[PDB]
Nucleic acid binder design. Structure first.
Lengths: 74, 168, 183, 142
RNA sequence: GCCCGAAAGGGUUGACCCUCCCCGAAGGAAACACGGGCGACCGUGGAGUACGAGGGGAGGUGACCGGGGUUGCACCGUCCGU
RNA sequence: CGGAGUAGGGGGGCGGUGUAAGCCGUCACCCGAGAGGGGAACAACCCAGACCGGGGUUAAGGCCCCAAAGUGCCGGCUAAGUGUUACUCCAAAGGGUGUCCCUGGCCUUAGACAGCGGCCCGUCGAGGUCAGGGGCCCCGAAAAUGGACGGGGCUUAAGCCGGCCGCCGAGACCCCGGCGCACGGACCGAUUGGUCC
RNA sequence: CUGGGGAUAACAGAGUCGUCUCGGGCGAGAGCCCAUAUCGACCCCGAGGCUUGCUACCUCGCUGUCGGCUCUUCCCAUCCUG
């Protein structure tokens, strides 16, 4: 089964923190963690220790807020 | 006089003590508070240093005049409590040029030593002149040797720059 | 990205036929064929119930802009084989009335500012020029050809050496395919 | 002799493969040298090659450099760049190669290899130019 | 690679070379059977096997070898004294 | 007790002075007085301290060709040949929302225009607009013989970010054999010894 | 006069750029009125090494010479010519 996931965490770059919430399709949460690390590392030059994941919770395909995922879910 | 890239760094020791420094000069700057000095305003627009600096008194005075003229022409004395917080204590010296024989500089001026995230100057204002206070901020920023950034402070000690900027 | 399957659709009108073979789009109407190459990686064009569809599968902003540019072009081709396009030009002169003639694939302007030498302007294949009094009309099916012919005629009369407030003689555009020009 | 059609191939990757073959000991013939491609912006590419062409010894122009203007010779020169030209091994390898514009009668209706790790569908961005375009800008008869 | 030979060096009381048997340090394969991983790959058994500097043996062969002069190819190399 | 040499030091890190280059001190890792493997070449930057002959494994770093080993894998960014530079040997204040992202307020069953008329009815119908922040790039950016990412050349890279998987690669480390030295011991000697352990 | 010295100056080179030359940011304002047609204060950020200085790495029997005549070539930070 292809579920849907919502991630909430914090990341630090050059001294300052910043929180984030994201949404993902997947078969697990391990894949979610890996992709989150890669994406934030590319887009803000942040290593994996300065990313702090607080929650990876499964959700529904209608309480989503990201057009791409909302549509890939339909 | 000489460029400020010579004197902006903070790597030399402090050189302040008047009872041992011979031939030391007097301050060109003499006024440090302006406007209405008791009015109990609301908003505090303050400048902070990004990294450590030595600011000369020539620059300090230029900023004084510019900012106060803007504020007097577009706010009016009965508002806009303006203050410069830092006094110039450090003595700048230059080598009287022989060559490098007996090199130990003679005094030429003064500067103020400012540390990382240290308030330089403040403008206290009311709700409906924030934009003019921020103009003063920008004019000042343009005349310093290194970079700075401004904050907006409320009573009770809180930072409100985000939203107060948003609503305008 | 913006979305996942950007899809634009153009409906064909009464008597038009669109062929799509190999990055080349071909349009037939009452009047003349029309061809155009439209290629970009990831962008596809094909035909539906009646429609022309342009489609991309995970686009960025620039890709969106390109899809909609292509759409604009196809619509102009269709409107052109359906009706056509026509531009309008006006002639003004203080002193020295200039004679404008159509002879071959060139427009000839003489007595411009008093010059003994005539200026010349190219006419691109498939565009018709008419001259009625102080007015010129440029009509055809291809929008780019029509506009280019008109711009040629207008640039054939250009002044760099004197103040254009006082010296205003020339030929100027006043209407591009319907929408008039205003300051 | 291995015969390679350069139509639609990326020049540097093609040249790397060919240099390795010549060093291993094979005879090679490249055809359709004008249809190979170079990726990037036209202005930067053309400026590079024009700068190459205007290099000369200030005291005597009969001592070079002699960078090429024609397409077959551009391709040959790139390969030469990928070899040990200062040694006898490299000189013998370079003699084992020939490059041709178009397809001459002698090679008509024959087996044309293709190098898979050079091919432009591999690419994504469409900014590219052609070696023939470069030659024409430099002033070569093809 | 081309050339030359003394016998002070060796060698039919056996030069060189070819094949087979035994022991073997550190180190150490692959094919193959199953499985884990999106993948580049990995784990298990095959297997500490087949190999392996070297240390011994047995038979086929029948005359060179070591050396020297000059020189080709590849890798490396900016003289001596102060 | 006896025999010397040394009284011009330098690289790198710390301090005072000086516009700076430098000058003067300090630490005592290196060069000097130090081979070999790397950084294109390099006194002191990285790995590593050297009797002789052989067999193996690793280090620093590297694997498109020059050139031994990957046109290696997954996710993303760059369009400027930017870059392809650990250091020896790399230009800013100030600007651009050019593109990829995290946030916060005001609008949104009709909003920001676009049109007919004197805020809106029929109009278009779906997301829009203001602020703050980050990543990569762009502007600011001019020199003299003909030319430098080491070269060729490279654009879902042969560039950059976050991670991963296998290989190559020293005189270092393991192993086999041989020479010497130091200490100890036994034995044999015309006398500063020798064979052996 | 002798013996020596780049352990130590003059000069070309090398380093650096206070000074110099060439720029830029903001905008006091001047311009009938109008910041930016033209001129741009005070403060702040830079490029070049053809101006002078600073230093003492190279050279003490290399040549130590300024200017002019002759002859070749390069840059643009353009006076004329497009």
């Amino acid at each position: 089964e292809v579920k849907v996931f919502r991630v909430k965490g914090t990341f630090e770059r050059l001294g300052k923190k910043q929180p984030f919430t994201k949404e993902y399709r997947a078969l697990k949460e391990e894949h979610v963690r890996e992709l989150v690390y890669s994406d934030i590392g590319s887009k803000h030059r942040v290593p994996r220790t300065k990313i702090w994941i607080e929650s990876i919770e499964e959700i529904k395909p209608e309480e989503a807020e990201d057009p791409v995922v909302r549509r890939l879910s339909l | 006089l000489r460029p400020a890239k010579i004197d902006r760094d903070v790597d030399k020791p402090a050189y302040t003590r008047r009872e041992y420094i011979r031939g030391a000069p007097g301050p060109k700057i003499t006024i440090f508070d302006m406007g209405n000095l008791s009015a109990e305003f609301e908003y505090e627009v303050s400048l902070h240093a990004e990294q450590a600096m030595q600011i000369r008194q020539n620059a300090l005075e230029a900023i004084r005049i510019q900012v106060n003229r803007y504020l007097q022409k577009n706010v009016g004395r009965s508002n806009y409590h303006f203050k410069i917080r830092v006094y110039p204590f450090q003595v700048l010296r230059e080598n009287p040029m022989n060559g490098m024989r007996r090199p130990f500089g003679k005094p030429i001026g003064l500067a103020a030593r400012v540390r990382k995230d240290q308030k330089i100057l403040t403008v206290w204002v009311n709700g409906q002149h924030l934009k003019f206070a921020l103009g003063a901020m920008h004019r000042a920023k343009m005349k310093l040797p290194y970079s700075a950034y401004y904050r907006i402070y409320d009573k009770e000690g809180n930072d409100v720059t985000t939203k107060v900027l948003s609503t305008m | 990205p913006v979305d996942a399957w950007i899809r634009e659709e153009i409906e064909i009108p009464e008597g038009v036929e669109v062929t799509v073979e190999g990055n080349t789009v071909k349009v037939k109407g009452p009047k003349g064929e029309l061809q155009r190459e439209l290629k970009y990686p990831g962008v596809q064009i094909f035909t539906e119930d009646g429609k022309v569809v342009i489609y991309k599968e995970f686009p960025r902003k620039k890709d969106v802009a390109i899809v909609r540019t292509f759409k604009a072009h196809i619509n102009n081709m269709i409107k052109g084989v359906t009706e056509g396009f026509k531009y309008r030009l006006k002639v003004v002169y203080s002193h020295f009335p200039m004679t404008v003639k159509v002879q071959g694939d060139e427009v000839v302007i003489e007595n411009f500012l008093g010059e003994k030498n005539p200026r010349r302007a190219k006419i691109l294949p498939g565009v018709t020029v008419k001259v009625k009094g102080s007015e010129i009309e440029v009509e055809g099916i291809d929008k780019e050809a029509v506009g280019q012919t008109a711009a040629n005629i207008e640039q054939a009369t250009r002044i760099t050496k004197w103040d254009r407030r006082v010296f205003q003689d020339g030929i100027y555009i006043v209407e591009k395919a319907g929408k008039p020009i205003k300051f | 002799m291995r015969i390679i059609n350069a139509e639609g191939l990326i020049l540097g990757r093609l040249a790397s493969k060919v240099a390795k073959m010549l060093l291993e000991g094979e005879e090679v013939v490249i055809v359709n040298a004008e249809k190979a491609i170079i990726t990037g912006n036209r202005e930067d590419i053309f400026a590079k090659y024009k700068q190459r062409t205007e290099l000369r010894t200030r005291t005597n122009p009969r001592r070079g450099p002699f960078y090429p203007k024609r397409s077959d010779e551009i391709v040959r020169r790139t390969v030469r760049g990928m070899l040990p030209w200062k040694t006898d091994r490299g000189r013998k390898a370079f003699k084992r190669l020939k490059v041709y514009v178009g397809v001459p009668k002698e090679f008509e209706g024959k087996e044309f290899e293709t190098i898979s790790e050079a091919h432009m569908s591999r690419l994504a961005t469409p900014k590219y130019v052609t070696v023939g375009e470069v030659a024409k800008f430099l002033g070569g008869k093809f």
